[PDB]
């Protein structure tokens, strides 16, 4: 008798048991060593899909640029970045016709928001590339450092309030013959101390710094055998990017196909609505087929030049000042520069020695001293390599930069709905690089033609769909946004329930934030009662261990435990004790929305409540816990 776990699928649908098929209880595969190699494949891969375009030398930076747009049409089934401008405009024109006034409404709404926007908004985000130090620093730190350096060069506008003057000077800063800024200098005093120093760089150096994108390896990524590269941009492009993403978001919000702006429990509704609508529209006696789609090299075949065209088309009726503002981010992305990792490692086994060759000195060593894969990588990288350790990456995109705009382009291809007036009608859903397509036709053979026509049509817009990762079957069972639908039942089982542990802020808060997540999971992710009950148990065990607050009847020894045990005997009413004070846990499903302080107020003894709730106690981000999520908590001695 040999146990075969896969046999559970004989008596259960795979969708119902799909949760067990996902290894989300294990370590997310992290990146070990240099991510420099991975960044190089991205550059080689990105240019390999656009080498048939036009190659020229950029006069602003001297880099070797490649432009696959309007290039030769693809001849094979490999990924292709040769998007035809006329085809893209045709899709957008069809898109606008189906939603009259949408482009104008989004442009006007985006502008109104831009006028009111202030510089403090740029402080919201993730790690950004700081040109002053050539490193990665928080958005607030980078914004301040950029602001201070602009003051040195007399570039003002940041203090003027609105984002327009601040973004105006950024463009102005690109013309200054030399740029002065504060740099961190590590002088050896033995000790090493970093100080400020007034550093100066030339105009071309600043141009490259402004266009550069720091590259790391995508860590914690789940569901892939091989790592990749995740890039972050500097402050020079942030502000312009926020507006364009706002512009794309406004358009996408009004699209039925779009599923990227939609978030939460509405995804299940979107899946059900689309399949229901397509089945109803199915011709009598026809066949409705659904394609579980997936795009590979989705970011490496999208062109900033196309996004520049889309921004022009979306803002057709708008002031030139706004049209110029919305067209800057694509301009700074067509001339982007990819900073390559942190070099390579070369070792001698006989001498037991190792050394790190930095990126500027990649080709200073003979290529025969690199392994085969790196040797080939560097041979192909030479044309686009810069002497400062960076590689020119004009074609392609970087994941996560233009997500809303990419969805708009994908939805546009879905709106064609037919080719050659053939006897099929296709539609679907789109969210960033993930899509699902439904085709209705009189028979399967005509349905396949519709899918093949869609495949060819996508190739014309720069959208490549993976044949290896895509499959088709009759409508009613498909997958989208990593969600499984089957016969009217949606089985979202890919989100990993966040570690039900203390949020690490304080005792009363963590209990409030913790109990909020379980409640949200019940409401949103359809988390069941029992599993919700157990999620409470696991968190409490974690909560007591971290905070050293076990039940007063427990035999745990500790510094605070002795005081907790003393309080347990002293207090007459044990049920009123807080969990953090060694009190019993009284949380349940019905009461996942009341702070424990308020819960135990009635049961709390007069002495304990007065001590804990002393108006002037010596121990005393309350709204949102660092993504911003609100939690309900009560001020008290535990709020240190």
């Amino acid at each position: 008798m040999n146990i075969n776990p896969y046999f559970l699928f004989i008596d259960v649908p795979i969708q119902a048991a799909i949760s067990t098929t996902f290894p989300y209880t294990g370590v997310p595969p992290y990146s070990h060593g240099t991510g420099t190699g991975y960044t190089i494949d991205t550059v080689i891969r990105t240019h390999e899909y656009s080498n048939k375009g036009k190659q020229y030398i950029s006069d602003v930076t001297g880099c070797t640029m490649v432009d696959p747009t309007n290039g030769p049409l693809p001849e094979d089934n490999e990924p292709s970045a040769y998007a035809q401008l006329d085809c893209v405009l045709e899709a957008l024109d069809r898109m606008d016709e189906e939603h009259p006034g949408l482009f104008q409404a989004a442009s006007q709404n985006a502008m109104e928001t831009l006028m009111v926007t202030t510089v403090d908004k740029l402080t919201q985000g993730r790690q950004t590339f700081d040109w002053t130090v050539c490193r990665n620093q928080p958005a607030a730190t980078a914004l301040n450092t950029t602001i201070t350096s602009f003051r040195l060069n007399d570039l003002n506008g940041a203090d003027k309030g609105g984002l327009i003057p601040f973004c105006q000077d950024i463009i102005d800063s690109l013309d200054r013959p030399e740029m002065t800024f504060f740099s961190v200098k590590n002088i050896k005093k033995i000790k090493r101390i970093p100080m400020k120093v007034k550093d100066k760089i030339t105009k071309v150096e600043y141009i490259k710094r402004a266009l550069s994108l720091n590259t790391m390896t995508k860590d914690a990524e789940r569901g892939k055998l091989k790592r990749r590269a995740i890039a972050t941009a500097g402050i020079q492009i942030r502000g312009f990017v926020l507006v364009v993403e706002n512009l794309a978001k406004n358009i996408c919000e009004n699209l039925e196909q779009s599923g990227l702006p939609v978030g939460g429990n509405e995804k299940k509704a979107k899946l059900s609505n689309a399949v229901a609508k397509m089945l109803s529209n199915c011709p009598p006696g026809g066949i409705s087929m659904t394609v579980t789609g997936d795009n590979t090299k989705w970011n490496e075949c999208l062109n900033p030049r196309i996004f520049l065209a889309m921004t022009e088309r979306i803002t057709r009726d708008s002031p030139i000042w706004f049209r110029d503002f919305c067209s800057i981010a694509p301009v700074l992305f067509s001339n982007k520069i990819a900073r390559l990792g942190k070099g390579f490692m070369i070792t001698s086994k006989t001498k037991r020695l190792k050394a790190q060759i930095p990126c500027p000195d990649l080709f200073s060593i003979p290529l025969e001293r690199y392994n085969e894969e790196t040797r080939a990588k560097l041979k192909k990288l030479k044309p686009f390599f810069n002497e400062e350790g960076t590689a020119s990456l004009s074609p392609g995109m970087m994941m996560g930069m233009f997500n809303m705009l990419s969805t708009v382009l994908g939805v546009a291809a879905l709106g064609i709905k037919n080719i050659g007036n053939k006897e099929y009608l296709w539609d679907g859903l789109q969210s960033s690089d993930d899509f699902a397509l439904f085709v209705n036709a009189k028979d399967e053979e005509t349905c396949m033609e519709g899918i093949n026509d869609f495949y060819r049509t996508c190739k014309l817009l720069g959208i490549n769909m993976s044949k290896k990762k895509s499959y088709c079957n009759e409508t009613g069972m498909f997958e989208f946004t990593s969600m499984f639908y089957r016969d009217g039942f949606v089985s979202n089982f890919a989100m990993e329930l966040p570690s039900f542990g203390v949020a690490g802020v304080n005792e009363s808060a963590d209990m409030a934030i913790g109990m909020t997540i379980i409640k949200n999971n019940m409401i949103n992710n359809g988390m069941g009662p029992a599993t919700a009950q157990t999620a409470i148990q696991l968190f409490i065990a974690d909560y007591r261990y971290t905070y050293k607050c076990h039940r007063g009847d427990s035999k745990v020894e500790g510094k605070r435990m002795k005081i907790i045990k003393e309080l347990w005997e002293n207090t007459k009413g044990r049920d009123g004790l807080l969990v953090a004070d060694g009190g019993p846990n009284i949380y349940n499903l019905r009461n996942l929305h009341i702070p424990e302080i308020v819960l135990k107020y009635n049961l709390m003894d007069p002495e304990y409540k007065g001590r804990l709730l002393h108006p002037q106690n010596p121990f005393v981000g309350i709204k949102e816990a660092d993504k911003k999520m609100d939690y309900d908590a009560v001020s008290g001695t535990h709020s240190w």
Partner: protein, 518 residues
């Protein structure tokens, strides 16, 4: 108004960043604003070559083939055991305790004190050394742990700290030199990547699956209480919980999971507390049997050596010495990484049984320790399933089916699911057996998780959904199938779970084919 003027540099970038066929931005701007396309897509599609197409093919049971046929090749070596700790061959020295919580160092000393023959064993009887492990280094290191654990001092720091520098292999580390010398030095070249060996199925992976889903006499899963239940939903939730915990509490996988969580927790506490020193970290657990008696179980000791690295991915050498009662000679191909000594014997139930000591030099990062603490969510993963399964039954018939599903009732026989095969004949099992199998499957995903398991599980999902479509006669189509198979197969290199999972998938696929024929 607003005058957002453009500078000289930005304008020049804009001019050169236009699609082919435009000299400058103004030409591009005018073309988009004025020229209208009315069938450019149709013109291009006709002008596009016909060689590019989805080339779709109908999927049939004959199209589907076994995944990774190389796992049956008998020339390849048997996939070895590479988990951090022994799972089914584990032996833990039980010391009955009243229930008081004590420091791990004191727990180890008392457990070893009870077994004085093993603690005092100074002459090692080497059974097999893997390929390069130094028997003298490993044993001398082990005796360091026992002496340090059994000393009167309250610190777990190893007393040698200089023999351990070389016993653990810490001292055999390459020396970094400035870049200029390396550039000049012609003999310095980049190393080739370490390709993982291709192995074949091993009978020890199936055995662990068989053994770790079984019920034992010891339960190690204890959970905090919750508030009183005043609503029917709370009562049914508690009832479903009670049935679930009762069936998973005593499974061997539950005890194994807790040991992994506790060990990785102690490892992480020491990692931050200790940076450049060697520590002994007992591999302990807390268990309670049916009678309610609580035991302290010691599964070995581990030398967490130095660290001197802050971050996510930075190896911290860990040398594990784990007690066991299984002869490594029985399955030689399973322990090519372990140096195991025969350290003594004991009478578990009046019958003599050998006690070996498996030694191995390992490495870990901060993330692995962090995610080791997070191996209890396998409890959440395993349960979320039966909730759905029980819920689906409750939809069919009103009254709760938890009692019916697990034990049956007047109008419903207890639920059964296919669990395994014997002699080529499918076997059925209760809902408890399926629950334990599901829990164990989740645990092995954590234990054997790596880049290979993520790829196989994610890539194999496409095949699983294709088979589901075939079962429902939905007439699935695949644009290409060899490419899908190649992506799945490229991840089957040396991971025990992936190789075994491929064998299980092939077995289940054949059964589905036979069922389809009828």
């Amino acid at each position: 108004g607003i005058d957002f003027k453009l500078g000289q540099t930005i304008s020049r970038l804009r001019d050169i960043s236009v699609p082919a066929g435009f000299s400058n931005f103004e030409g591009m701007r005018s073309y988009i604003d004025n020229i209208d396309p009315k069938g450019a897509i149709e013109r291009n599609l006709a002008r596009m070559s016909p060689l590019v197409s989805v080339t779709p093919k109908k999927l049939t049971w004959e199209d589907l083939r076994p995944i990774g046929p190389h796992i049956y090749n008998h020339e390849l070596p048997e996939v070895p055991y590479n988990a951090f700790l022994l799972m089914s061959d584990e032996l833990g020295l039980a010391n009955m305790t009243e229930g008081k919580s004590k420091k791990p160092k004191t727990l180890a000393k008392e457990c070893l004190e009870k077994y004085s023959t093993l603690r005092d064993q100074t002459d090692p009887i080497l059974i097999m050394k893997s390929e390069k492990a130094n028997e003298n280094f490993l044993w001398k290191l082990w005796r360091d742990c026992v002496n340090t654990i059994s000393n009167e001092e309250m610190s777990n720091e190893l007393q040698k700290t200089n023999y351990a520098k070389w016993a653990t292999g810490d001292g055999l580390t390459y020396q970094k030199i400035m870049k200029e010398v390396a550039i000049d030095d012609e003999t310095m070249c980049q190393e080739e990547p370490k390709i993982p060996n291709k192995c074949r199925v091993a009978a020890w992976v199936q055995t662990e699956m068989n053994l770790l889903s079984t019920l034992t006499s010891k339960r190690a899963l204890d959970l905090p209480e919750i508030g009183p239940d005043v609503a029917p939903v709370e009562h049914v939730g508690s009832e479903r919980r009670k049935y679930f915990v009762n069936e998973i509490n005593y499974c061997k996988a539950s005890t194994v999971m807790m040991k992994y969580v506790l060990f990785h927790t102690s490892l992480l506490n020491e990692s931050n507390a200790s940076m450049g020193k060697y520590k002994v970290i007992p591999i302990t657990n807390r268990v309670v049997n049916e009678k309610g008696e609580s035991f302290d179980m010691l599964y070995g000791l581990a030398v967490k050596g130095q660290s001197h690295l802050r971050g996510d991915t930075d190896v911290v050498t860990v040398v594990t010495f784990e007690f066991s009662s299984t002869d490594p000679r029985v399955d030689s191909g399973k322990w090519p990484k372990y140096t195991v000594f025969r350290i003594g014997s004991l009478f578990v139930s009046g019958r003599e049984k050998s006690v070996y000591l498996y030694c191995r030099v390992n490495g870990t990062n901060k993330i692995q320790m962090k995610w080791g603490m997070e191996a209890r969510r396998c409890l959440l993963q395993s349960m979320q399933q039966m909730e759905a399964i029980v819920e689906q039954e409750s939809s069919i018939q009103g009254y709760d089916m938890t009692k019916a599903c697990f034990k049956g009732d007047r109008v419903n026989s207890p639920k059964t699911f296919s669990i395994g095969t014997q002699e080529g004949k499918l076997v059925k099992g209760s809902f408890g057996k399926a629950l334990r199998v599901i829990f164990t499957k989740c645990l092995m995903h954590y234990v054997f998780g790596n880049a290979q398991l993520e790829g196989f599980s994610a890539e194999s999902r496409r095949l699983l959904l294709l088979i589901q479509a075939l079962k429902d006669r939905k007439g699935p189509w695949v644009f290409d199938l060899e490419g899908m198979y190649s992506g799945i197969e490229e991840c089957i290199s040396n991971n025990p779970w992936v190789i075994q999972s491929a064998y299980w998938f092939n077995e289940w696929l054949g059964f589905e084919k036979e069922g389809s024929k009828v």
